[PDB]
Amino acid sequence: EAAAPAGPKEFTEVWNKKAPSTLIVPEFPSNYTAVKAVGEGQVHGDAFPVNFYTPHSILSQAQKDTVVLPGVDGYFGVKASHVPTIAQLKPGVVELHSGAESEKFFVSGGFAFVHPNGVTDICVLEAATLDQVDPAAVKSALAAASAAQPTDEFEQAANRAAIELYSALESAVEAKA
Amino acid sequence: GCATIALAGVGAGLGVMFGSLINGAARNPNIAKQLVGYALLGFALTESIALFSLLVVFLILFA
Amino acid sequence: GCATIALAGVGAGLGVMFGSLINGAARNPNIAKQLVGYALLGFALTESIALFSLLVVFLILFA
Amino acid sequence: GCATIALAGVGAGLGVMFGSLINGAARNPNIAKQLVGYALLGFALTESIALFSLLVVFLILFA
Amino acid sequence: SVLAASKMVGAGCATIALAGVGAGLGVMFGSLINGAARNPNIAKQLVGYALLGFALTESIALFSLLVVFLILFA
Amino acid sequence: SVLAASKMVGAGCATIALAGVGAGLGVMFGSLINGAARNPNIAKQLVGYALLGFALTESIALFSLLVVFLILFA
Amino acid sequence: SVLAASKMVGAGCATIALAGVGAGLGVMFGSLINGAARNPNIAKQLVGYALLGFALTESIALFSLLVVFLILFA
Amino acid sequence: SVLAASKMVGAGCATIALAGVGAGLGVMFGSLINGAARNPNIAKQLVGYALLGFALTESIALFSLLVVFLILFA
Amino acid sequence: SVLAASKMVGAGCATIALAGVGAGLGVMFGSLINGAARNPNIAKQLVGYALLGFALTESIALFSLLVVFLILFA
Amino acid sequence: SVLAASKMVGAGCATIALAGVGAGLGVMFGSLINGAARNPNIAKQLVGYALLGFALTESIALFSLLVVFLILFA
Amino acid sequence: APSGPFYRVAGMSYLRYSNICADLLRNVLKEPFKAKAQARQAIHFRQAPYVDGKAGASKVYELENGIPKTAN
Amino acid sequence: LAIADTYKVRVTFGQASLIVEELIKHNPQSYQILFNKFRSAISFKPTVATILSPDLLEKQLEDVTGNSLDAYDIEASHERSDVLRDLTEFHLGVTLYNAMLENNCS
């Protein structure tokens, strides 16, 4: 079941025998990272790296010793030697703990992994903080959203996503710390 | 005294049913108004068996 | 003696309900009052079986 | 002797509730200070059923 | 001699309330294993939570024990 | 004397309390397996937490088997 | 004549702890399948821990069998 | 002749232990299906663990029949 | 006629062991439904394990029926 | 006429195995609802397995209904 | 016939679904940040099927409000 | 398929996800991304990023004497084959957005 032992190690020796000699081998995205899952370490006690990403910015890359992830089965917290997991997140609040401090970011979905070396790397789409979100427009949008139930199952899925996102955003902004 | 031990099963059933309603409201708080509307129907259809046991415990003492 | 055995299922059902209240409260802690508002609804609705099993004992002993 | 059997069911309910607390505190430990407060509420609220079994084992002995 | 015979027959049926208590300790400690398996960095506080549940539900087992001790000799 | 006959009946019926205790130790030692399946690097610590649960859930088996001897040999 | 018949009728119903022991061993050996189905390459260590759980949960069954041989022969 | 008569109801109350072992094998052979539904390619070793968990809790049912056949005609 | 009456009440107390196979079979056939709802493309192997588990846990219901037919007509 | 009353008492005790079959069919027809809420496109096959599971556990319901009439009228 | 989550049985991919969720997070943002949120939301591209290698028409996307929630 | 007029206003993840789902209308077992990795203002060494199909090739390539993806605890709603189906779409969209943004500044 491993008939093609692929990797960045093998591609050069298969590529050099077909491309002309003036061409160097094309690089790989793994050569722009140093932290993997197989490379152990990255704990050294309690503080472990959280890599909280989004497509247009990086809101965190430092080490925080506790991060809770609003997973689709429920809000769950991540510790240093946490279970290696791939977790799908429902739209909720991500909070980053490194001590007494908590930065509260409401994310709009996206997966969040825990790798077996002990780095978590949250992968969300739109990471708006809970300061710049108003409690006015969300009820004005869900009140129109909670009425229209059309015959489009595609719009049924869109309405269901809108309903869960607006309800979780209201419940996450009204109960702030 | 022996006929009314059947209330334990409907008690332990309704405990799991309202536990399921708690975890279902913890899934999504939007559809809770249909979760309760299904849950009280299931509670009534289990109290059917509870009152079926009570019917025979009243039949065995007074008839 | 044989009549009050049915509180075993009532105690186990309430333990399942109030363990589910913990696992639901830890699944969304911002809703940790509405879930208790559902847990007390299920508790007050399952004590009908508890008063059943507490007055059937007094139906046979002193009536 | 046959009256005190309901203690097994309330003990199983206590154990599943105090196990679901460990599950809920392993989900997110920061709200365990509220989960333990809800578990002592559930514990004292099913000890109502436990003592309602523990007084009927006393009421038929000396009364 | 039924006066002290029925104490023994009632005590043998009275001590069976330890069964659901032992089942509760078993499910609580199995959940303790799963809880220390999800995130082991709290597994001192989670085992403290397990003892916190354990003593409060062994309280009901010693309540059954004083019931079965109470009808045996008093 | 049917006092000893009821002692034998009560010492029989006393040992059904190990049913739930066996079910509890079984579900705890089963939860061991998928717990250590979740993270194999905390394997020995989970077996240690299982033994700490075992040596406190066998206390109910101790409580039952000293009560069956208080029935039989007292 | 009621005494050696009472030994029989007591030590009959003394063995139904094996129901809960079998239920615990069944849920343990089913959680063994679920844990070896989660991560299949740990299937030799966890089956050894399941054998440890079996050999420490059979202490309860042989504790019941010690009483059912203690009633019937002592 | 209640001596050979109460052994019948003793064996009848003895074979109650043939319930929980069936419940344990039910949850075990259901967990085998739910584990073989995750990864179908490990199902040979999972059934090999299922039969080993069967024969190690089938011994509970054979012990229940052993005490039953010990009390019926011995 | 305590023999021919104790045989009937022992048969009545002996057929309560079909509860545990009646719940183990139910949860096994429900786990088969859930495992076929996970992935339908192995709905042939899972029923092949389900009828095997039906047979091997029915074996305990036949233990109960055989001890019933032994304490009824022997 | 103690056998004619003992048949009624045992026939009461014979049918408490119907509770386990009721709980098994409840947990089967509940996980059928969970499976039809997992993927609704296969709501016509899982009921097709639910009917054979219903037949194979109503088998054990009628196993108990056999012996309650074998002790009543045979 | 598609068996999975609620968007997949409705035929919706994860990218369009999570982009719908991100768009509706942007739709409830504050107007100092909601105006620049439309800058990172505006979609201007086009595509073209190629039936032979040069032959084919085109399809344009000039949506400035976000990802199409309607059926594709 | 040919996509044009891609850097008109700017590059958005909606646009990149749209091109990704256009590549997902066709059903391969692999993907190859050819773009110029922006290393410096003087050097552009190109990269080939690769995206695998979930049940077709991805868990098959995670297989050494068994599997290495079973260490990850799947925590989604549905099972692993339907969370890898979404993860490969998210991965193709992310690496395509990064591809056409690296190539734009290159």
Side-chain angles (χ1 to χ4, degrees), chain A, chain B, chain C, chain D, chain E, chain F, chain G, chain H, chain I, chain J, chain K, chain L residues 1-19 21-106:
Chain A
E1 310 106 320
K9 292 167 68 178
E10 47 88 20
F11 189 84
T12 61
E13 296 92 33
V14 192
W15 201 77
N16 289 306
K17 277 77 177 175
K18 197 56 177 306
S21 302
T22 190
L23 271 70
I24 211 65
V25 62
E27 316 285 338
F28 315 101
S30 296
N31 309 117
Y32 309 110
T33 182
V35 285
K36 279 94 163 197
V38 62
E40 291 293 328
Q42 310 282 343
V43 177
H44 60 274
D46 48 350
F48 69 106
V50 53
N51 296 154
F52 176 73
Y53 295 125
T54 204
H56 52 269
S57 66
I58 298 177
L59 287 183
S60 178
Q61 216 168 324
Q63 294 197 170
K64 305 248 195 169
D65 57 8
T66 304
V67 48
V68 319
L69 283 169
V72 68
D73 274 356
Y75 287 78
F76 75 104
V78 180
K79 290 303 159 155
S81 180
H82 195 83
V83 54
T85 184
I86 299 174
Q88 176 170 328
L89 307 193
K90 63 184 185 294
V93 48
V94 175
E95 45 189 357
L96 282 305
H97 313 327
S98 175
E101 203 277 332
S102 307
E103 278 175 12
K104 315 295 204 70
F105 296 119
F106 177 79
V107 307
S108 88
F111 302 96
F113 319 111
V114 173
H115 284 49
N117 69 310
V119 56
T120 185
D121 42 1
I122 312 166
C123 298
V124 309
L125 267 295
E126 188 88 5
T129 181
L130 282 147
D131 295 333
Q132 62 182 35
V133 175
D134 49 293
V138 57
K139 47 172 177 303
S140 298
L142 65 88
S146 61
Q149 191 166 355
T151 187
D152 288 331
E153 51 173 355
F154 211 84
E155 188 40 60
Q156 278 165 198
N159 194 1
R160 182 172 158 174
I163 278 173
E164 62 186 278
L165 164 63
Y166 289 148
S167 297
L169 176 54
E170 267 197 5
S171 296
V173 76
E174 285 313 305
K176 283 311 291 152
Chain B
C2 195
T4 183
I5 322 169
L7 276 303
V10 297
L14 293 175
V16 177
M17 194 198 62
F18 284 111
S20 280
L21 164 137
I22 288 173
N23 283 331
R27 287 308 196 207
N28 43 354
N30 163 56
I31 204 55
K33 305 306 167 189
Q34 290 184 359
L35 299 176
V36 176
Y38 280 9
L40 301 183
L41 191 144
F43 151 82
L45 270 63
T46 299
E47 283 293 326
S48 70
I49 292 99
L51 293 174
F52 274 167
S53 75
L54 288 176
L55 188 136
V56 191
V57 77
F58 297 146
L59 194 147
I60 209 58
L61 196 78
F62 295 107
Chain C
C2 302
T4 185
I5 306 177
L7 294 199
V10 174
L14 285 175
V16 169
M17 222 187 283
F18 285 134
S20 82
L21 181 61
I22 305 168
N23 265 325
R27 264 170 145 84
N28 44 3
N30 299 117
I31 329 290
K33 190 55 177 61
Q34 195 189 349
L35 302 185
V36 189
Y38 278 139
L40 299 178
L41 178 60
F43 161 74
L45 210 67
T46 194
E47 288 285 315
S48 65
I49 302 173
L51 63 90
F52 278 159
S53 298
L54 279 167
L55 272 71
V56 165
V57 185
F58 292 159
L59 185 75
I60 56 172
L61 272 179
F62 319 109
Chain D
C2 65
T4 174
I5 308 183
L7 196 137
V10 73
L14 280 190
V16 64
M17 179 195 59
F18 284 136
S20 170
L21 173 132
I22 310 174
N23 257 330
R27 290 314 289 254
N28 42 6
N30 310 342
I31 319 105
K33 304 302 128 190
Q34 199 189 13
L35 303 192
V36 172
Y38 283 143
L40 268 70
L41 182 132
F43 162 70
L45 205 59
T46 193
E47 278 293 323
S48 176
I49 302 310
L51 268 73
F52 285 161
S53 159
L54 266 156
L55 63 89
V56 172
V57 72
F58 287 156
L59 197 143
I60 62 176
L61 289 174
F62 306 136
Chain E
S1 87
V2 69
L3 278 66
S6 163
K7 293 189 306 192
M8 312 309 289
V9 158
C13 308
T15 181
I16 77 171
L18 270 68
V21 172
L25 319 184
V27 299
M28 185 190 53
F29 285 133
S31 74
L32 179 67
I33 299 177
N34 289 114
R38 273 189 51 95
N39 42 4
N41 283 255
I42 326 102
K44 305 307 156 182
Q45 189 177 330
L46 300 187
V47 168
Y49 288 150
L51 301 189
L52 175 60
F54 168 83
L56 294 175
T57 194
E58 280 268 356
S59 72
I60 206 68
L62 59 89
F63 279 165
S64 69
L65 272 172
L66 69 93
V67 160
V68 70
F69 284 157
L70 190 64
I71 70 180
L72 264 175
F73 309 111
Chain F
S1 174
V2 304
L3 201 152
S6 154
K7 275 162 61 177
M8 299 296 172
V9 170
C13 190
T15 68
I16 86 177
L18 308 175
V21 184
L25 271 315
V27 68
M28 184 208 70
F29 270 120
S31 163
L32 196 159
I33 310 299
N34 74 321
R38 270 159 165 81
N39 43 353
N41 54 0
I42 316 297
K44 311 301 183 175
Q45 192 182 347
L46 281 179
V47 177
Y49 292 146
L51 289 175
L52 196 140
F54 176 86
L56 273 67
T57 324
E58 282 287 328
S59 56
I60 295 296
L62 180 138
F63 288 162
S64 178
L65 289 159
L66 270 70
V67 155
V68 79
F69 268 62
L70 195 145
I71 285 179
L72 256 178
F73 289 92
Chain G
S1 66
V2 192
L3 284 85
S6 72
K7 287 166 55 162
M8 297 324 104
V9 77
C13 80
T15 81
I16 79 173
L18 265 71
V21 175
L25 262 67
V27 70
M28 184 188 70
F29 284 132
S31 283
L32 175 62
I33 309 162
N34 269 316
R38 284 194 184 275
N39 45 2
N41 291 124
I42 319 296
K44 267 85 190 179
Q45 179 183 1
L46 314 184
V47 76
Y49 292 156
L51 288 192
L52 184 133
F54 153 77
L56 270 71
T57 47
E58 280 312 288
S59 86
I60 289 181
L62 271 74
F63 278 163
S64 88
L65 291 190
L66 190 147
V67 183
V68 87
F69 298 149
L70 168 65
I71 286 297
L72 294 176
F73 292 126
Chain H
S1 179
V2 76
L3 272 160
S6 78
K7 309 201 309 169
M8 303 299 109
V9 68
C13 293
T15 183
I16 304 174
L18 280 305
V21 60
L25 282 172
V27 303
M28 194 206 72
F29 281 117
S31 159
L32 166 69
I33 304 170
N34 257 328
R38 296 161 175 254
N39 39 359
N41 64 328
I42 319 293
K44 202 78 190 65
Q45 202 199 9
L46 295 173
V47 166
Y49 289 156
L51 292 177
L52 189 136
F54 171 77
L56 262 51
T57 196
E58 169 109 51
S59 86
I60 307 298
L62 287 188
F63 279 174
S64 298
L65 291 184
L66 188 142
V67 61
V68 157
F69 273 89
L70 180 62
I71 209 159
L72 282 171
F73 295 127
Chain I
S1 68
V2 67
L3 289 148
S6 67
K7 272 179 277 195
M8 308 303 162
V9 73
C13 296
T15 73
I16 81 163
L18 310 177
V21 299
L25 275 169
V27 66
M28 189 200 63
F29 285 138
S31 188
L32 162 72
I33 288 178
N34 204 273
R38 291 289 179 80
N39 41 358
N41 289 270
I42 50 165
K44 177 250 289 180
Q45 189 181 9
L46 294 190
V47 191
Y49 296 156
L51 295 190
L52 178 69
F54 163 73
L56 265 67
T57 203
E58 199 102 336
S59 179
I60 288 95
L62 295 177
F63 278 175
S64 300
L65 278 175
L66 192 144
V67 69
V68 158
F69 295 144
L70 184 58
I71 75 178
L72 258 182
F73 297 99
Chain J
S1 177
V2 70
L3 57 91
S6 175
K7 285 177 309 177
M8 308 305 177
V9 168
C13 286
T15 58
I16 71 157
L18 268 70
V21 186
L25 272 181
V27 73
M28 192 193 78
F29 284 132
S31 71
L32 165 66
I33 296 168
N34 263 339
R38 179 74 77 198
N39 42 357
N41 317 131
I42 204 148
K44 313 302 165 187
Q45 173 165 329
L46 301 176
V47 187
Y49 287 159
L51 294 192
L52 67 90
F54 173 76
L56 260 58
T57 70
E58 277 271 4
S59 173
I60 281 83
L62 56 86
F63 273 16
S64 291
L65 273 156
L66 167 71
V67 194
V68 69
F69 302 151
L70 179 73
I71 69 180
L72 263 187
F73 305 132
Chain K
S3 65
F6 64 98
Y7 40 79
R8 181 67 57 170
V9 62
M12 194 183 305
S13 295
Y14 189 80
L15 295 162
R16 195 186 290 270
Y17 155 74
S18 201
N19 278 288
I20 276 165
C21 293
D23 285 346
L24 296 173
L25 182 54
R26 293 184 199 108
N27 285 6
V28 299
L29 264 175
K30 196 69 86 168
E31 187 66 28
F33 293 90
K34 201 188 183 310
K36 88 164 303 304
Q38 209 65 252
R40 69 159 94 98
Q41 208 179 336
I43 295 171
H44 298 77
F45 79 106
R46 76 173 204 275
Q47 68 179 343
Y50 273 70
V51 295
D52 195 23
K54 271 289 160 218
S58 76
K59 158 79 161 305
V60 296
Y61 300 89
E62 285 86 0
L63 287 90
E64 295 88 4
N65 313 294
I67 291 92
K69 310 178 180 48
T70 61
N72 48 1
Chain L
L1 188 54
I3 292 95
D5 198 352
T6 177
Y7 321 123
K8 198 52 164 42
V9 181
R10 47 193 57 98
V11 176
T12 44
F13 197 73
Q15 162 192 6
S17 66
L18 269 152
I19 301 167
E21 65 189 1
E22 289 330 287
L23 301 180
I24 276 161
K25 298 289 179 56
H26 312 260
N27 304 143
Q29 289 186 354
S30 183
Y31 287 90
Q32 317 273 4
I33 311 296
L34 264 298
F35 70 107
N36 299 283
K37 201 69 181 157
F38 177 73
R39 303 307 302 151
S40 67
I42 72 172
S43 193
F44 308 107
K45 291 166 289 296
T47 52
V48 178
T50 307
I51 308 104
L52 302 172
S53 293
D55 290 332
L56 303 195
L57 204 51
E58 160 65 38
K59 62 178 70 174
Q60 304 193 36
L61 261 295
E62 291 275 355
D63 280 357
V64 287
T65 181
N67 201 313
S68 178
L69 210 61
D70 284 325
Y72 287 95
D73 197 301
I74 309 300
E75 212 268 333
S77 67
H78 288 60
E79 54 93 16
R80 188 173 62 172
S81 71
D82 293 333
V83 73
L84 257 52
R85 171 71 62 180
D86 292 333
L87 205 48
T88 194
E89 299 162 28
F90 193 27
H91 169 54
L92 163 67
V94 160
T95 196
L96 201 66
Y97 177 81
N98 175 73
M100 68 175 49
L101 197 59
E102 283 262 336
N103 201 280
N104 181 84
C105 75
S106 165

